[PDB]
């Protein structure tokens, strides 16, 4: 089980980045995938997840208030890849961004943050002044 | 007359950036706006322009299918969405402006008169 | 010829980091080794170098005004490693830091920025508010 | 009485950080100052302290076995600041680091903490 992040870097304020996260063997399309971030000196917080419920027949996507209307999560079940399109980047968005996976295959909107078990190494996103 | 570029930076190969260029006092919506780039040690080449009956947008072969130019005449801002970035795209990117006439003439590269200071885009291996 | 940087990361303002740069096959102790940095959207500037002087009887170390009294360069000719101790970090120090090498000596002429020929891939240093 | 920590962040294995802890009213040069850390899911453990001994003939600094030879505590009584120089960082050092004051159960005044993350 591997999760390799890519697409990070350094950008001016107002610029844009696009993160990617390819996934090794765990049957990607049945898992709820998510993006986390960790500020320097602060705890790791949740950014966005998307994933699937059986009790509603369908998918549930989430976005935090600080990334609302600016970030976009998407998945490609054929290539087992998760994406995070970050537009209109602010200097408060500067963190190391992690790509996580939750494992019990049916969680929709009852997704606790503690359900994410498999993690990646991360990628740096730096938004300067 | 000022042209301030933004949105540049450093990214690995395959990543994406989005440049912006706000414009100070001149009628933005009546001018043909363009993007240039200058490699280290090489001459300044043209990337993409858009502007003026109908509108005409241009893209160079090296940025074909990967770059996207757009303008916002309300906010007087020019955009350049750079997707699938290659290490050959590493340059300082300039935002230029030309004035259209004719009426059957063409915008050549020498028509761009007003320029910006630029922004650096670095695509590493 | 390889130059691998390490020791970067994310830190608050006032914190400290220490970069390292191991060198592959090129005779490290006879080359002038340096550190560069590149801000987001700006050109690549020079930070500090150490090595040859101009006289074949001395070492010469350099430090830019923006890093004066806060940064410290050092080399280990036995392990072929270059170090950069960054203390009292400011948010203006946020860049991708590169480790470069020069080989021109020129008895009578001092070190210029264009003499650095071999470069590394770099490491990210982010100093947040 | 306030204790504000700073200097934390994220770094690779083998990298270095330096924590700082400024102190509000007024103790500082007569109190034994220390650093604690708390791993995710584990209890809060002690890292290092420095301060007075019994009797007043001298100072005593302490370092835990897991940080021995890699960490360095220091204080500045003029600026009322405590420092922790963390060199050769291991992934087992990943915790939230607290700055505490005494004069392990003697430490009464605490700070909010700062996160130190050492990734692979």
């Amino acid at each position: 089980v591997q999760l390799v992040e890519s697409g990070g870097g350094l950008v001016q304020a107002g610029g844009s980045l696009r993160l990617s996260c390819t996934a090794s063997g765990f049957t990607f399309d049945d898992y709820t995938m998510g993006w986390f971030r960790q500020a320097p000196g602060k705890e790791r917080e949740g950014v966005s997840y998307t994933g699937w419920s059986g009790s509603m027949s369908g998918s549930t996507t989430y976005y935090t208030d600080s990334v609302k209307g600016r970030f976009t999560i998407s998945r490609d079940n054929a290539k087992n890849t998760l994406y995070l399109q970050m537009n209109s980047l602010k200097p408060e968005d500067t963190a190391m961004y992690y790509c996580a996976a939750a494992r019990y295959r049916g969680i929709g909107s009852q997704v606790r943050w503690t359900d994410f078990i498999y993690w990646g190494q991360g990628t740096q996103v730096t938004v300067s002044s």
Side-chain angles (χ1 to χ4, degrees), chain A residues 13-105:
Chain A
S16 187
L17 292 173
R18 179 175 225 247
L19 309 177
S20 63
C21 178
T22 60
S24 88
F26 65 91
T27 320
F28 183 83
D29 42 68
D30 285 353
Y31 276 43
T32 88
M33 305 293 305
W35 287 101
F36 286 78
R37 77 187 169 182
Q38 187 168 32
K42 303 185 187 177
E43 291 155 333
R44 184 157 59 190
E45 71 163 333
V47 184
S48 176
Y49 64 85
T50 174
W52 184 69
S53 47
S55 306
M56 269 177 302
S57 325
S59 154
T60 281
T61 83
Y62 174 86
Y63 294 96
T64 325
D65 251 354
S66 43
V67 300
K68 194 189 257 60
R70 308 184 302 112
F71 280 27
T72 296
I73 198 177
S74 62
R75 61 197 303 168
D76 195 0
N77 295 315
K79 302 185 183 304
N80 295 25
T81 319
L82 189 72
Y83 301 98
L84 183 59
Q85 179 71 51
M86 311 153 70
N87 297 336
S88 300
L89 281 170
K90 297 184 174 185
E92 50 167 288
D93 298 329
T94 300
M96 179 96 65
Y97 282 74
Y98 299 95
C99 162
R103 87 158 165 209
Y104 278 130
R105 282 168 80 206

